Amino acid sequence: MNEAIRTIQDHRSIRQYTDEAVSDEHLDTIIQSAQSAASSINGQQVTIISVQDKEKKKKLSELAGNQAWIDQAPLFLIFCADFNRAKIAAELNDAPLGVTDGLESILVGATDAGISLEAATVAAESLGLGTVPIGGIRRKPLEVIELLDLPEYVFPVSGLVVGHPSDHSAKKPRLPQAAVHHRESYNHDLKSLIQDYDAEMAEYMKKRTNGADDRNWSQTVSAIYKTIYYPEVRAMLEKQGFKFEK
Amino acid sequence: MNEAIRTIQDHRSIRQYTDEAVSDEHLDTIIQSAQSAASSINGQQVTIISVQDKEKKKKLSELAGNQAWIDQAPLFLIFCADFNRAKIAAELNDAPLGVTDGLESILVGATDAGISLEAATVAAESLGLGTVPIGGIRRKPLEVIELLDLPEYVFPVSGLVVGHPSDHSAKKPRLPQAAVHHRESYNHDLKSLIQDYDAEMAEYMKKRTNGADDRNWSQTVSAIYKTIYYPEVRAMLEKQGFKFEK
Numbered sequence A, B: 001m002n003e004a005i006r007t008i009q010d011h012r013s014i015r016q017y018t019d020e021a022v023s024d025e026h027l028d029t030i031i032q033s034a035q036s037a038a039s040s041i042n043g044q045q046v047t048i049i050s051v052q053d054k055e056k057k058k059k060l061s062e063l064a065g066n067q068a069w070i071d072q073a074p075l076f077l078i079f080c081a082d083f084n085r086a087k088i089a090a091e092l093n094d095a096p097l098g099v100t101d102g103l104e105s106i107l108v109g110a111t112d113a114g115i116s117l118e119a120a121t122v123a124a125e126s127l128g129l130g131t132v133p134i135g136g137i138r139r140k141p142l143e144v145i146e147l148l149d150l151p152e153y154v155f156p157v158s159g160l161v162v163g164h165p166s167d168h169s170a171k172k173p174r175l176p177q178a179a180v181h182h183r184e185s186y187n188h189d190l191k192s193l194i195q196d197y198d199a200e201m202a203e204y205m206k207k208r209t210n211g212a213d214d215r216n217w218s219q220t221v222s223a224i225y226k227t228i229y230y231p232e233v234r235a236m237l238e239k240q241g242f243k244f245e246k
């Protein structure tokens, strides 16, 4: 398998970091690789905010749910869906901005930010660094907008903790190929596959905690998806000037 | 510096393919790399449908807006935001599925699908193959759901055209670093950067068409984003059991 494939295949997210600062040469490579990725209609609907200042990064850590790894790492990247450039583009050509009144602008912005994050991940991890995305930036997103001074048509999607690792960690097992990859049409027989994966996941958790926790995949997923954990999501989009087509 | 960064740095979407079929060994590597990528709460909210049958793949091409490259390439991947596994997980633990009644489930599903599309992009491109994501899967989404037999809590995000290229094409220039990468806080002075970017994009389009087309970046973006081009987006999510918190 190629160095590119071995960077993706050997993926492990880390929460343990060193005092070692991320150099500007490393950051520029992470931003250039993220920009190099594909974007819907070459509109490049992703804005990246680099937070290195401890005080600001501490506020971001608390607003994401007091995650120790955010304040631990020297650099915290923030992937925002950006339609402000599309607004400047429309103003330059005396045209209105219609897309932001539909749910498509939300789907375009979120999908593009996921593409940019993964490119930033594969670039950073190939350099020897450790990454962990922070989807928790949508916990208190109105406070995130105020902090990062986000204008109209810009919304925070996910964060990304970039730093030098202190621990190698362990690869979390993934769902069986047959459960994720469906040939030609959708495969509805997935219950047995989820049951077999839960058995493998309970054994993984057991070996990870030294027989302290028996948490399977279905257990830990259903506990958080039991409710609407992030209520301020619609309030965040409606504040930035995004509307929907009922 | 390394093979992973090199694969991303020289990226280009391929729209001209050969009759050469994508092997099972290549497909399995692309799928395994996509699964190897990070997912919000390890929920793995991405489902991948492999379309290799010419007749089905032709229907998907015509629904995406007569995109020739879809019927030309031997494989047409389709990344779907999946909460049906989360529904099976909740049923196995006698728990309700609350997340789907909020906009967070839409943001999680779209961001995670973008990640999995990017992990497949770097894997396929490093193997020598050519790719082109299809955002056109959202043109007639209700027909896509019928075709792929997409159940409740499952929605099409973006397709991916994988095949053996017949031409190298060219790298599309990206926005100036200062316009996409903002240090500490958001930079509101982007108009001048877009204007300079339009001059460099008009020159790019002149050299690629041999002085036939003068299309700049802002003009291309203004025209499409002038309106809500995909109206069946909210009509797709709601049909698939997704609600919004008002």
Ligand SMILES: Cc1cc2nc3c(=O)[nH]c(=O)nc-3n(C[C@H](O)[C@H](O)[C@H](O)COP(=O)(O)O)c2cc1C
Pocket (backbone or CB within 6 Å): A011, A012, A013, A014, A067, A132, A133, A134, A135, A136, A137, A158, A171, A172, B037, B038, B039, B040, B041, B042, B111, B112, B115
């Ligand atoms: C969009 C997104 C959001 C995430 N948010 C968080 C988060 O708030 N906190 C955290 O510690 N990990 C977060 N993660 C990391 C996941 O928990 C992790 O990727 C998953 O458990 C898979 O494990 P692995 O990446 O270590 O192989 C997130 C991942 C993604 C892709």
Ligand SMILES: Cc1cc2nc3c(=O)[nH]c(=O)nc-3n(C[C@H](O)[C@H](O)[C@H](O)COP(=O)(O)O)c2cc1C
Pocket (backbone or CB within 6 Å): A036, A037, A038, A039, A040, A041, A042, A111, A112, A115, B011, B012, B013, B014, B067, B132, B133, B134, B135, B136, B137, B158, B171, B172
């Ligand atoms: C989510 C997404 C959707 C896209 N949808 C389409 C599409 O419907 N048709 C198409 O030909 N290209 C589509 N593309 C490809 C873009 O036009 C292309 O990535 C962009 O012009 C940047 O150029 P490059 O990837 O060749 O460097 C899409 C890309 C992404 C990331």
